[PDB]
Amino acid sequence: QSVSRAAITAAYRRPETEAVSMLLEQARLPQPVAEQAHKLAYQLADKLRNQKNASGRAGMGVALMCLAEALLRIPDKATRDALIRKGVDMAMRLMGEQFVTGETIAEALANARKLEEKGFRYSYDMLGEAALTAADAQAYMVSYQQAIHAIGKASNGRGIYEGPGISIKLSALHPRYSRAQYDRVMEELYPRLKSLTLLARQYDIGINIDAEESDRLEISLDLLEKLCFEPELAGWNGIGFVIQAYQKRCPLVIDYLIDLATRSRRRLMIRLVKGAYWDSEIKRAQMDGLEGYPVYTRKVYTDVSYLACAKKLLAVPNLIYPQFATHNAHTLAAIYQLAGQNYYPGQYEFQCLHGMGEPLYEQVTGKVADGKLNRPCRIYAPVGTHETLLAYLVRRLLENGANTSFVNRIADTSLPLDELVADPVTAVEKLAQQEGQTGLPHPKIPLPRD
Numbered sequence: 001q002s003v004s005r006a007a008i009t010a011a012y013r014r015p016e017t018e019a020v021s022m023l024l025e026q027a028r029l030p031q032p033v034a035e036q037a038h039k040l041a042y043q044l045a046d047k048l049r050n051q052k053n054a055s056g057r058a059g060m061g062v063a064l065m066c067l068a069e070a071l072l073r074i075p076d077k078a079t080r081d082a083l084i085r086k087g088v089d090m091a092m093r094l095m096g097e098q099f100v101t102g103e104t105i106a107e108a109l110a111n112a113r114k115l116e117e118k119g120f121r122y123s124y125d126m127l128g129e130a131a132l133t134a135a136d137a138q139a140y141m142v143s144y145q146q147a148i149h150a151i152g153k154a155s156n157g158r159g160i161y162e163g164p165g166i167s168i169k170l171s172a173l174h175p176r177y178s179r180a181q182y183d184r185v186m187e188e189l190y191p192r193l194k195s196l197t198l199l200a201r202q203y204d205i206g207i208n209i210d211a212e213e214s215d216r217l218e219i220s221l222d223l224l225e226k227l228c229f230e231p232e233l234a235g236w237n238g239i240g241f242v243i244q245a246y247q248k249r250c251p252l253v254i255d256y257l258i259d260l261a262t263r264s265r266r267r268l269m270i271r272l273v274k275g276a277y278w279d280s281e282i283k284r285a286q287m288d289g290l291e292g293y294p295v296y297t298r299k300v301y302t303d304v305s306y307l308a309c310a311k312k313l314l315a316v317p318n319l320i321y322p323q324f325a326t327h328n329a330h331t332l333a334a335i336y337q338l339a340g341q342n343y344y345p346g347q348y349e350f351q352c353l354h355g356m357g358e359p360l361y362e363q364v365t366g367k368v369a370d371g372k373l374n375r376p377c378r379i380y381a382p383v384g385t386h387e388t389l390l391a392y393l394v395r396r397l398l399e400n401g402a403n404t405s406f407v408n409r410i411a412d413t414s415l416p417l418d419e420l421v422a423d424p425v426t427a428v429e430k431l432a433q434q435e436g437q438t439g440l441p442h443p444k445i446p447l448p449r450d
């Protein structure tokens with residue numbers, strides 16, 4: 001292929017100067033919106049850093065304190081004045097626990113209530129991906145079936161917005177998905193996706209297809225296309241799909257999705273993310289030796305792409321329920337403002353990962369009289385034992401450990417608040433004036449052919 005599909009194909013690896021130049025005006029916050037976004041972002045990030053006065057205590061060497069402490073333990077003021085494989089497995093489960101909501105779906109669900117009463121929602125992720133065998137994919141299938149039964153019974157008619165949903169990885173459902181051919185995916189994967197989706201619809205819970213590696217985008221769109229035209233799914237708006245703003249294709253995938261929601265007569269649930277596989281995408285493209293990268297190479301370009309994509313999503317509320325997944329205070333503030341006045345619950349939600357967004361979103365989800373923004377947030381809740389945790393944990397380490405990540409820069413007491421929440425468009429134009437051209441690739445990431 002259609003007009004919208006062909007345009008996705010042709011954007012696959014377009015030069016960054018071109019891709020970034022085209023996004024800029026789509027991403028620019030109008031003057032007054034930009035300033036309310038800055039102020040809100042500043043406030044959120046200020047509260048985050050300085051929850052337990054962490055920066056005001058910088059406002060106030062160590063051996064002296066130990067002596068002042070021992071002196072303060074003198075009870076009477078007068079007296080005082082007068083005076084390899086195992087290490088890896090272990091470190092994985094130790095660092096990883098903070099990102100896991102429970103080992104079983106029942107355990108995760110039984111803990112649902114605490115944050116659900118505060119206005120939080122949930123999307124449960126049965127950990128495990130990249131099925132290597134036919135038996136592996138069968139077992140993931142039954143784990144997903146089981147989870148939908150338990151989630152749906154706990155949802156108990158609350159429906160797709162207020163009630164819990166499930167997130168699935170297509171790589172879990174087909175052996176060797178990474179190299180699978182179109183014909184085998186449709187024969188084998190598609191009937192399992194269709195079956196899980198029919199089940200979710202019986203319980204009226206959301207079912208989201210997670211986005212994985214970029215060379216799987218095209219087959220996931222073929223699967224989505226077919227799925228949206230199932231008679232048993234007519235009139236039901238529970239299908240969800242993730243799109244990754246670090247991809248050059250993202251804006252064009254949105255044109256496609258908008259046309260699909262129209263033709264298939266539904267409102268799609270669309271989770272907009274930046275993306276979780278950047279380091280691997282860069283390595284992969286450098287080994288393939290093709291004309292360029294399917295993702296941006298500077299983090300600020302991804303931020304620009306996200307804002308442009310968020311605007312496009314918010315413009316079509318009859319066709320799309322946008323789910324804005326982020327832990328970045330500026331991104332959140334910019335969305336809040338871009339969504340305009342006269343919020344209604346079913347306009348959009350925020351999303352965050354378990355063990356990562358709680359402090360940001362404790363300022364967001366809840367009553368205005370308690371100082372909150374009163375916007376719903378859906379927590380993505382990984383569920384599994386130690387044997388399913390590895391790949392997810394490594395992605396979290398890369399996310400938390402990168403110096404370009406907001407969750408890393410916020411902990412840096414030396415980087416000032418204004419720089420942390422600086423506007424990405426303005427950042428890009430600043431690079432452009434310094435370097436001579438808009439959207440130049442990262443200086444340390446040359447094209448694969450160089």
Ligand SMILES: Cc1cc2nc3c(=O)[nH]c(=O)nc-3n(C[C@H](O)[C@H](O)[C@H](O)COP(=O)(O)OP(=O)(O)OC[C@H]3O[C@@H](n4cnc5c(N)ncnc54)[C@H](O)[C@@H]3O)c2cc1C
Pocket residue numbers: 209210211212242244246271273274275276277278295296297298299300301302325326327328331351352353378379380399404405406407442
């Ligand atoms: C609820 C939820 C669900 C998610 N589901 C998925 C999913 O299905 N598939 C998926 O891929 N991701 C998914 N993610 C996103 C991913 O796991 C990270 O959480 C997310 O990208 C972090 O973005 P941020 O705005 O929180 O952080 P920010 O710190 O503002 O931006 C972080 C990031 O920018 C990108 N980046 C980093 N360096 C560069 C660079 N040099 N050049 C270009 N881009 C760069 C990467 O996307 C990286 O995560 C999900 C996130 C959430 C909250």
